[PDB]
Coordinates of C-alpha atoms and ligand atoms in Angstrom, one line a residue:
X1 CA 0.0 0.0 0.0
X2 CA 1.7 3.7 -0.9
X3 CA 0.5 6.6 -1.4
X4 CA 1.9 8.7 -4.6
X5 CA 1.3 12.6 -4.7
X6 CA 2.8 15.8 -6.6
X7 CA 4.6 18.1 -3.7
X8 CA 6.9 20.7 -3.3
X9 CA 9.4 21.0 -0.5
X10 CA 9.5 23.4 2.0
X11 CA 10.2 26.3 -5.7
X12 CA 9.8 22.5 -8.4
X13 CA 7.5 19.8 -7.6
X14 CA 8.3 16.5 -7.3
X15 CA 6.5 13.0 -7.1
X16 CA 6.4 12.3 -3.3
X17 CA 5.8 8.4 -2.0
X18 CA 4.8 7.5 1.4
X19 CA 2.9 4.4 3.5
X20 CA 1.7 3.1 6.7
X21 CA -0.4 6.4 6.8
X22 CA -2.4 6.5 10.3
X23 CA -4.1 9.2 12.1
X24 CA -2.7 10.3 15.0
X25 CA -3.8 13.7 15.9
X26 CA -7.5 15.4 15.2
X27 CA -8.5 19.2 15.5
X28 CA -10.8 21.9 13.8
X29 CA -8.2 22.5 11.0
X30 CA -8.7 19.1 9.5
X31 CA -6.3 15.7 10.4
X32 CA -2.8 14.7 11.4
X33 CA -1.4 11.4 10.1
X34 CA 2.0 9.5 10.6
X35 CA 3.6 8.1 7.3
X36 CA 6.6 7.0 6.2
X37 CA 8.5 8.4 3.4
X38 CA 10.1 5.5 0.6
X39 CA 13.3 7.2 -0.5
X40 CA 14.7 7.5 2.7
X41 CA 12.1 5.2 5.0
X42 CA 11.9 8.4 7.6
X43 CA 8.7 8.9 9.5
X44 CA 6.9 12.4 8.5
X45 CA 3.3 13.5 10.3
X46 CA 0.7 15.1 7.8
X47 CA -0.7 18.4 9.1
X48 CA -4.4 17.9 6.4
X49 CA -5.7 21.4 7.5
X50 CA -9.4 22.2 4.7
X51 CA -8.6 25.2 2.4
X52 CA -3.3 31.6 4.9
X53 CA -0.9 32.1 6.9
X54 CA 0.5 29.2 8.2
X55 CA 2.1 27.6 5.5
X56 CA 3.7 31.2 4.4
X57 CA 5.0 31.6 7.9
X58 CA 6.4 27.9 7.6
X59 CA 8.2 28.2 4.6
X60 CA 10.5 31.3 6.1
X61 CA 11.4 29.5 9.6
X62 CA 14.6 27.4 9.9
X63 CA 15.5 26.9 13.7
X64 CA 16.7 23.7 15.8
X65 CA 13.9 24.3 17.9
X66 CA 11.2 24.5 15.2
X67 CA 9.3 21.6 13.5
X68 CA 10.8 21.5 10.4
X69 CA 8.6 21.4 6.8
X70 CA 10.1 19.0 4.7
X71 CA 6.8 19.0 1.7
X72 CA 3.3 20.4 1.1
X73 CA 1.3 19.4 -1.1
X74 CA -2.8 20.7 -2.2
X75 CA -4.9 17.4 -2.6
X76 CA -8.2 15.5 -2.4
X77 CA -15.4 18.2 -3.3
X78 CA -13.0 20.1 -1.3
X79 CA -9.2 21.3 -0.9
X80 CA -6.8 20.7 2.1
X81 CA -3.8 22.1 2.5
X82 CA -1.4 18.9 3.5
X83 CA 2.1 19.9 5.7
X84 CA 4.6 17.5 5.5
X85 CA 6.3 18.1 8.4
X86 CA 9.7 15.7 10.5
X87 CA 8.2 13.3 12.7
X88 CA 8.9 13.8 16.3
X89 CA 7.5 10.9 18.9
X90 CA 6.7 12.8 22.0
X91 CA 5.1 16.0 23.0
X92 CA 5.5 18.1 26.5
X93 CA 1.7 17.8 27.3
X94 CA 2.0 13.2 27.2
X95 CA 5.4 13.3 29.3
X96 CA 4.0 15.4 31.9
X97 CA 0.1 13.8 32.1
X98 CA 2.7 10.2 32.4
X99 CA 4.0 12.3 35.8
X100 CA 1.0 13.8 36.8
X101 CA -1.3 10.1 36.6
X102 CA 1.7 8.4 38.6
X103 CA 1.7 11.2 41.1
X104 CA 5.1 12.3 40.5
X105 CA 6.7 15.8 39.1
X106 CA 8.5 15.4 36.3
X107 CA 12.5 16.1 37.3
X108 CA 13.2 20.1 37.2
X109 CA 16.6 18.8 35.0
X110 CA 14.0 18.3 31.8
X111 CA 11.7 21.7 33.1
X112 CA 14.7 23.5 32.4
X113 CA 15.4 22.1 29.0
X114 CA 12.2 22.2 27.6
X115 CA 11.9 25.4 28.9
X116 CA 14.6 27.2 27.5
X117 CA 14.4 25.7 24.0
X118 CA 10.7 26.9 23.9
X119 CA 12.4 30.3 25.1
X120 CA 15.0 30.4 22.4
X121 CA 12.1 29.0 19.6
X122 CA 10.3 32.0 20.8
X123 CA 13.4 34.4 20.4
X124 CA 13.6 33.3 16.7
X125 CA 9.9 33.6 16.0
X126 CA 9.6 37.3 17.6
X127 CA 12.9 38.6 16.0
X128 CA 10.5 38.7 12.3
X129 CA 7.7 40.0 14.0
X130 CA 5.9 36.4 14.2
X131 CA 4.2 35.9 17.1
X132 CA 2.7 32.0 17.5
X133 CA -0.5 32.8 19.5
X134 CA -1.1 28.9 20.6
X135 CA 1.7 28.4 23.0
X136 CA 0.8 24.9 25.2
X137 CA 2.2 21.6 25.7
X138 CA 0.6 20.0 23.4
X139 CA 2.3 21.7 21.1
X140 CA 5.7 21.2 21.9
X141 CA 7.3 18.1 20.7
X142 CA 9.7 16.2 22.3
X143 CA 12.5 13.9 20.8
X144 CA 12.6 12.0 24.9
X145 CA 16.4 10.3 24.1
X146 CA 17.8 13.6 23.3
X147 CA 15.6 15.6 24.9
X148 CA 15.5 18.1 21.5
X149 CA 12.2 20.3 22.0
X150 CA 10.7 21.4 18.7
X151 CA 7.5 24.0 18.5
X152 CA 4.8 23.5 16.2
X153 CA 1.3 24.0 15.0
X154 CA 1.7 27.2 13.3
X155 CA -2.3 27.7 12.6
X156 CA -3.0 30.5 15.0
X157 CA 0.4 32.1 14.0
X158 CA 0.7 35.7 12.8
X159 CA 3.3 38.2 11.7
X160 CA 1.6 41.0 14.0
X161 CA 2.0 44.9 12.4
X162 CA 1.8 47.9 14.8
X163 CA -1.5 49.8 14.0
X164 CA -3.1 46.8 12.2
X165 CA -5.8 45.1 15.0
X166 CA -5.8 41.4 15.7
X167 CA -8.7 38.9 17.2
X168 CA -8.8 38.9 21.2
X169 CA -10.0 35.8 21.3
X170 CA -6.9 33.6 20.3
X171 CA -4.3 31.1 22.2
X172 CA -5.9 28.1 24.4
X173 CA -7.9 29.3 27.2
X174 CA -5.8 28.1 30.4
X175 CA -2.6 29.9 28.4
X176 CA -4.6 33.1 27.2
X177 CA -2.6 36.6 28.9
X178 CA -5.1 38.8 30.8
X179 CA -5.1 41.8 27.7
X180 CA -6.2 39.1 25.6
X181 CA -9.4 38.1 28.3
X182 CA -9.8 41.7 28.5
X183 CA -10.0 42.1 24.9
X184 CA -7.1 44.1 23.8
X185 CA -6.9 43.8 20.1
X186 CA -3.4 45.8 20.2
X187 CA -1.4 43.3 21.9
X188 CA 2.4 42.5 20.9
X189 CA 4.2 38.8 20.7
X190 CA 4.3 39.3 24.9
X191 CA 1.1 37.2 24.4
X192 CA 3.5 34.0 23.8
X193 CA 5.7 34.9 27.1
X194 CA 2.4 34.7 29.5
X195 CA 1.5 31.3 27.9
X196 CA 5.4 30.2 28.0
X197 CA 4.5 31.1 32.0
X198 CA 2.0 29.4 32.1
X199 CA 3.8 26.0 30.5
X200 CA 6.4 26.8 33.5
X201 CA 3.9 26.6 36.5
X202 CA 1.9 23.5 34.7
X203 CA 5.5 21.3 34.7
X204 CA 6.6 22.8 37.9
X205 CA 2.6 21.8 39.9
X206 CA 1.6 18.6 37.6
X207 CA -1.7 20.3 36.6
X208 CA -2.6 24.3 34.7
X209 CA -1.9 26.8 37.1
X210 CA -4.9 28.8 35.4
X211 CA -7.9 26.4 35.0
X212 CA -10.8 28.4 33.9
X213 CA -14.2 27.0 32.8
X214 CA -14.6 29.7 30.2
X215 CA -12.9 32.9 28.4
X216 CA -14.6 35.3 31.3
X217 CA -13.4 33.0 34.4
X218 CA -10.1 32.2 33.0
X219 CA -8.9 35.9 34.6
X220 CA -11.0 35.0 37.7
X221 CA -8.2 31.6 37.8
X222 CA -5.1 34.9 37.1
X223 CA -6.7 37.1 40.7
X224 CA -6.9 33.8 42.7
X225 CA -3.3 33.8 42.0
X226 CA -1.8 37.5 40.7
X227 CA -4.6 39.3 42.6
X228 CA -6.6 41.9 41.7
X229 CA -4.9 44.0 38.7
X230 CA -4.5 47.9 39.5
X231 CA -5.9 50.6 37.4
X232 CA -2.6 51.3 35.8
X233 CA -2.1 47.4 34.9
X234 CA -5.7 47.5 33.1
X235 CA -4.7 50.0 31.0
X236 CA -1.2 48.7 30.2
X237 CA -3.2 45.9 29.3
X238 CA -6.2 47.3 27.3
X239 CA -6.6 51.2 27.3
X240 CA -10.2 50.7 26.1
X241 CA -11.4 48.9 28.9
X242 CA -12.8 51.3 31.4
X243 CA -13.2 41.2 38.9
X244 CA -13.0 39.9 42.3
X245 CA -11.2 42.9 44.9
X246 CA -8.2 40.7 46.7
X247 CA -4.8 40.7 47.0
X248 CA -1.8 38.6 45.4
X249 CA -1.5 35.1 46.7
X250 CA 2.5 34.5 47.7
X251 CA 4.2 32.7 45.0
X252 CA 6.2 30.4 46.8
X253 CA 3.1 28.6 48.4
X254 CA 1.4 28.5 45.0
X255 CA 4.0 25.6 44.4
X256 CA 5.6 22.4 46.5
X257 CA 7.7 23.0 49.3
X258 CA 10.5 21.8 48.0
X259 CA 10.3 23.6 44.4
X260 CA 13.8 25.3 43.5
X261 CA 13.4 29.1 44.3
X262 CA 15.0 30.0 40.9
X263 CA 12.0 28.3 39.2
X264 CA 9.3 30.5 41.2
X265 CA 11.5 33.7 40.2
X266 CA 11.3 33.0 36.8
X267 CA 7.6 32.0 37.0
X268 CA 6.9 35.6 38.6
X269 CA 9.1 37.6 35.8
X270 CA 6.7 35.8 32.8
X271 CA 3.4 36.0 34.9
X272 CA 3.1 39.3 34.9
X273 CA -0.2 41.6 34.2
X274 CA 2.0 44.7 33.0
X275 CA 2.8 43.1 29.3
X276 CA 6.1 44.9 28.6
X277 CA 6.8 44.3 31.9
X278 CA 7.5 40.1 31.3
X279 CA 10.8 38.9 30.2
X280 CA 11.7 38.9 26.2
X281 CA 12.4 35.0 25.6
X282 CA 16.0 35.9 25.6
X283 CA 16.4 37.4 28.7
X284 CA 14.1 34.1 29.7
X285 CA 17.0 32.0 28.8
X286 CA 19.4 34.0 30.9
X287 CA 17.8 33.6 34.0
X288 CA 19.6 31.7 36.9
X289 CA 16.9 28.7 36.7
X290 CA 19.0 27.7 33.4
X291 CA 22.2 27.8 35.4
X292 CA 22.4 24.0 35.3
X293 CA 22.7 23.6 31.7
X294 CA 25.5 26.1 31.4
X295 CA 27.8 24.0 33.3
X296 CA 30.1 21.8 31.3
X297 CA 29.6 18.9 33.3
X298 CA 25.6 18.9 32.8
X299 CA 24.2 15.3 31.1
X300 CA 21.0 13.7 30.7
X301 CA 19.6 11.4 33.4
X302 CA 20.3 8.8 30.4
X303 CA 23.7 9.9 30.8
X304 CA 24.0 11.0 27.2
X305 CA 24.8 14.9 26.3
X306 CA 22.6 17.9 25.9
X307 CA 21.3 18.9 22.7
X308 CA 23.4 21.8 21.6
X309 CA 22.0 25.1 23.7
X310 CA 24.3 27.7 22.9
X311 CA 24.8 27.8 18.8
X312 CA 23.0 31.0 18.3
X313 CA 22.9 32.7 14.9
X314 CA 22.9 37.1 14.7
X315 CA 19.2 36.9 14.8
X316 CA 18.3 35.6 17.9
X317 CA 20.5 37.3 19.8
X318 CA 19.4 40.8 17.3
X319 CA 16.5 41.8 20.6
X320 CA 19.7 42.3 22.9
X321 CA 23.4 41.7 21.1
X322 CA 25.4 42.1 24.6
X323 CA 23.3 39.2 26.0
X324 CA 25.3 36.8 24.3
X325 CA 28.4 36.8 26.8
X326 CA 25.6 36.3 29.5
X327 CA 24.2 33.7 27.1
X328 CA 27.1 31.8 25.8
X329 CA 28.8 29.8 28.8
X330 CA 33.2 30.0 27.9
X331 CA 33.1 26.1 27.5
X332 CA 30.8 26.7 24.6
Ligands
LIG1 C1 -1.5 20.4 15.1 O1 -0.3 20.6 14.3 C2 0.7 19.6 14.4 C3 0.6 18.4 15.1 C4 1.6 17.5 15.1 C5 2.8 17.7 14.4 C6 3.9 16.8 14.4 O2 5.0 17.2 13.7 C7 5.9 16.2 13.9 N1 5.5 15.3 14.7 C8 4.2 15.6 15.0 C9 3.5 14.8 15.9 O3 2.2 14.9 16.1 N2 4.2 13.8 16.5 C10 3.6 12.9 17.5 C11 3.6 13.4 18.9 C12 3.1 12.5 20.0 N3 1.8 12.0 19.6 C13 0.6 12.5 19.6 N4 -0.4 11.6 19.2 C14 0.4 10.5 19.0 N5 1.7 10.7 19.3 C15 2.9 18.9 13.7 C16 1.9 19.9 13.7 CL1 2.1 21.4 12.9

């Protein structure tokens, strides 16, 4: 059994075989399917999303930490739009339901890692204006031998254009920042650093930090956490806009006992009502709660070495050039 189609890589077309085709993923875009390819015998998913923007925002990205888009290809009354994209076996959200059904948190070693490559796949992203607008777990895959994070599902993405309005309405609703809930339609790529925040908590507690039951109680979830936000945060947030009254929870018993301080600082620098008051995802990889994987000694619990952390190109590092010696450990 094979499937033959015409497809062009992520330019000229080019007869593309695959086989054992299954579904393995299911959304309101359409289907995902794992196949493998017959050249090579590599396993590819299939993004099948009916009938903008993704697949033009796909075709300029080429990052370590970004699922790469090997074909697409236009096929079977109605037309999908099929992404050929590297198969990768894991994602974040599996690993960390696996902890969270056994009753254990998942070691702070692989928080850290997957952390800071969804920082620095972030950094990349915001450096062309592109701002995802669906960061989650779900859609961060995970290679779990070499622990090699790679961001996907590019569907909600948008190259955002100061003036130009977007939808308020956008990102998952337990990972939605509170401008967003208040319906700012002038929001920046900030938006991604709140849900990258909210990633953080969810793999340091072993549930969402913000569970809301709808789009209106989802900022009720932020006060019983961040408090009440002041006049001066609701307009930072949306100007337009003219809530329970109570006061910031402390941030150290929203966690374990035992969770590394470091971890909670960070959490407190992303989780922040005041947008441009959160961390850029570079100065997120900077923080001290990375510490641990710029030492020269740092392994895998399989005992293997890190994926490589450190090679950064001129246009991640373009937000804040003299990060870099901050950044880059000597070793490296
Ligand atoms: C919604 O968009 C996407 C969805 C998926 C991918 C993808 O890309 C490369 N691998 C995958 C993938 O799904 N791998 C399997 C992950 C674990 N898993 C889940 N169910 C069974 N196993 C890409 C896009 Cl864009």
């Amino acid at each position: 059994k094979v499937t033959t189609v015409v497809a062009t890589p992520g330019d000229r077309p080019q007869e593309v075989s695959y086989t054992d085709t299954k579904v393995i993923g299911n959304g309101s875009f359409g289907v995902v399917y794992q196949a493998k390819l017959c050249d090579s015998g590599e396993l590819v998913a299939i993004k099948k999303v009916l009938q903008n923007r993704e697949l033009q925002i796909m075709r300029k990205l080429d990052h370590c930490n970004i699922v790469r888009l090997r074909y697409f290809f236009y096929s079977s009354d109605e037309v999908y739009l099929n992404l050929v994209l590297d198969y990768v076996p894991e994602t974040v959200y599996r690993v960390a339901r696996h902890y969270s059904r056994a009753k254990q948190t998942l070691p702070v070693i692989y928080v850290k890692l997957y952390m800071y490559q969804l920082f620095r796949s972030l950094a990349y992203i915001h450096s062309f204006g592109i701002c995802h607008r669906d960061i989650k777990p779900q859609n961060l895959l995970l290679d779990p031998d070499t622990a090699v994070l790679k961001l996907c599902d590019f569907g909600s993405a948008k190259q955002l254009v100061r003036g130009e309005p977007n939808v308020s309405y956008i990102c998952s609703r337990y990972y939605r920042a509170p401008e967003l809930i208040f319906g700012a339609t002038d929001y920046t790529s900030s938006i991604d650093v709140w849900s990258a925040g909210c990633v953080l908590a969810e793999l340091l507690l072993g549930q969402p930090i913000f569970p809301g039951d709808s789009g209106v109680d989802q900022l009720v979830e932020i006060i019983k956490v961040l408090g009440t936000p002041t006049r001066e945060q609701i307009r930072e947030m949306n100007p337009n806009y003219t809530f329970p009254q109570i006061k910031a929870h402390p941030w150290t018993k929203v966690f374990r006992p035992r969770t590394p301080p470091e971890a909670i600082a960070l959490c407190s620098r992303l989780l922040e009502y005041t947008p441009t008051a959160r961390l850029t995802p570079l100065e997120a990889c900077a923080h001290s709660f990375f510490d641990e994987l710029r030492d020269p000694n740092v392994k895998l619990p399989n005992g293997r070495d890190t994926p490589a952390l450190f090679n950064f190109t001129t246009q991640e590092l373009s937000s804040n050039p003299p990060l870099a010696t901050i950044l880059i450990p000597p070793h490296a």
